[PDB]
Amino acid sequence: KVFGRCELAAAMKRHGLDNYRGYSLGNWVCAAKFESNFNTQATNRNTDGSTDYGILQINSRWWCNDGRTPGSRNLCNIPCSALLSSDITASVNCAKKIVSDGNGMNAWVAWRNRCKGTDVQAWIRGCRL
Ligand SMILES: [Cl-]
Ligand SMILES: [Cl-]
Ligand SMILES: [Cl-]
Ligand SMILES: [Cl-]
Ligand SMILES: [Cl-]
Ligand SMILES: [Cl-]
Ligand SMILES: [Cl-]
Ligand code: NA
């Protein structure tokens, strides 16, 4: 599924991402835009043989099992395919573990390079939340 900006803001709000560990909703929407263009089916292969999956591009080296990332961990205890669902619940629950992991949203390279220190409130402007 390709989400609308406000549709995704509403979904993330319902799943408790607004101000989760101090990150306002606009941060999560901004990261999703630049990681996946709001497409739950996005996949991208890394030089190391790991893959990134879903609207928040969660990596198979640490967070999910895809059966082809040798010597990887499965810290969210899910198959990486669960992250491609139109239902974002698995992606949001896994993201909450990642952001708790010590580096905050700096885990998402697109957030650090394209959202951090910008007016992220712009991403939820005009939405009924
Ligand atoms: Cl947009
Ligand atoms: Cl915000
Ligand atoms: Cl594996
Ligand atoms: Cl594991
Ligand atoms: Cl699993
Ligand atoms: Cl959803
Ligand atoms: Cl933080
Ligand atoms: Na893995």
Identify the nearest ligand to the CA of 1 by its number.
Answer: 6
Quote the domain boundaries for residue 97: 5-124
* CA 87 to ligand 6 center in whole angstroms: 4
Query: Is 101 annotated as ligand-binding?
Result: yes
Lookup: tokens for 6? 């406000």
Q: How many CB atoms lie within 10 A of CB 89?
A: 12
Domains of the chain: total: 1
The coordinates were experimentally obtained by X-ray
> In the numeric block, which tokens belong to residue 27?
């941060």
CATH number at residue 34: 1.10.530.10
Q: Hey, which bits of the chain come out as E strands?
A: 43-45, 51-53, 58-59
76 belongs to a structural domain: yes
60 within 8 A of 72, measured Cβ to Cβ: yes
Residue 45: strand pairing partners: 51
Report the C-alpha gap between 12 and 79 in whole angstroms.
Answer: 21
Give a yes or no: residue 129 inside a domain: no
Neighbour order of strands in the sheet with 58-59: 43-45, 51-53, 58-59
| Residue 62 within a domain | yes
Pick the catalytic residue from 7, 52, 66, 119. Answer: 52
Q: Where are the alpha helices (DSSP H) in the chain?
A: 5-14, 25-36, 89-99, 109-114
